[PDB]
Amino acid sequence: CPFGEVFNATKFPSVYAWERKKISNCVADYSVLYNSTFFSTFKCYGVSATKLNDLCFSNVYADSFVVKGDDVRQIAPGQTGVIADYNYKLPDDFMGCVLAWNTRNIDATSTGNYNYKYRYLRHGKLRPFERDISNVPFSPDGKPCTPPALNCYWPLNDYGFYTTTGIGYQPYRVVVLSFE
């Protein structure tokens, strides 16, 4: 199975426009992941992450995106925030592995890396494993709007990654493997 096509891919998307890469019709090793100690979360729900080489799944879906350092804990079943509610929600019966690692040396230019966007306003909470790539002006009273106007904001904000920051604001590339 190609895990370099997911993990070693150069361009991860934003957290709001995340994407799935279906892994099918191949033998999967899974041992290129847990033999590495540089992963900062590697949290697996259901499976025990070392008993993955004797399980044959129907299909493996790999959701890949980029969050902030402190936003990694919202990638979990049942958690809430501005990433778990408006951007990327995991189901309560999630069976899979959440892998995250600190890509400060790639995604943090010292000028500022304002290319990864998250949604901070929405009308309601996302259903699990759903996506919202729509960028429409958000008005809290529900009427359509056109900025610049009062009570009218764009729903997407920029992370703004900097090299000289702590590990709670550093960029963390997140790959969420989902098994079925």
Epitope: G4, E5, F7, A9, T10, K11, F12, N105
Partner: antibody, heavy 127, light 104 residues
């Protein structure tokens, strides 16, 4: 002073192995990848293979595996490329080019390799 | 596999759009090189939108889905060169080069 000084021009026979060197200078040698790209006359650029100068592995083209073999010499700051069994289609200008990506801490996996920056002068070999 | 048109014919003054399409590029960077005939290529754009020093402020890269785009605003008479695009196989192995575009 960043520069990649290659070998000189050569002529070969269809089957004689060729050695093209790529002497590096200036930059920290074990940091950046060194790529190997050829170019047939009248054709576009063709990527052959790369090398990690701190002995961490090679990668070759999918239609050149078993023919091209690259190697590194840390003491002389040089990278050699060996092509065994040339054909009539392996007449090209052979470019040794650097990588625009300072590799460092373990190997921050997810890295942007490619972006060939400090291309060499080009060794022309004719079969 | 990365494909691109073989030639773009623009008079001095217009806008030349060198497109570069590849199915393995929603997640991979495009590196653009120019090669005036005779010498080594010169890297023009890197990481789909960024331009190194020494490259003038006419080139402006883009990426809309699985399609790259280099734009020369205000083409002069020293832009007659072959333009190549680069990618990988959605891993970071097997770097590929485009077919070339002789911009005239």
């Amino acid at each position: 002073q960043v520069q990649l000084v290659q070998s000189g021009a050569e002529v070969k026979k269809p089957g004689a192995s060729v050695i093209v060197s790529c002497k590096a200078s200036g930059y920290r040698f074990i940091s950046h990848y060194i790529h190997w790209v050829r170019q047939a006359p009248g054709q576009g650029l063709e990527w052959m293979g790369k090398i990690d100068p701190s002995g961490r592995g090679t990668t070759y083209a999918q239609k050149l595996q078993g023919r091209v073999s690259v190697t590194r010499d840390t003491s002389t700051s040089s990278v050699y490329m060996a092509l065994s069994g040339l054909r009539s289609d392996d007449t090209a200008v052979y470019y040794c080019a650097r990588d625009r990506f300072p590799l460092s801490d373990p190997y921050v996996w997810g890295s942007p390799l490619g972006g060939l920056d400090v291309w060499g002068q080009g060794t022309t070999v004719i079969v | 596999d990365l494909t691109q048109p073989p030639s773009v014919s623009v008079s001095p003054g217009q806008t030349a759009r060198i497109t570069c399409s590849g199915d393995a590029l929603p997640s991979q960077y495009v590196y653009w090189y120019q090669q005036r005939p005779g010498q080594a290529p010169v890297l023009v754009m890197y990481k789909d939108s960024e331009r190194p020093p020494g490259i003038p402020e006419r080139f402006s890269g883009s990426t809309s889905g699985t399609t790259a785009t280099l734009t020369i605003t205000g083409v002069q008479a020293e832009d007659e060169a072959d333009y190549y695009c680069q990618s990988a196989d959605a891993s970071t192995t097997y770097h590929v080069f485009g077919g070339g575009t002789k911009v005239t």
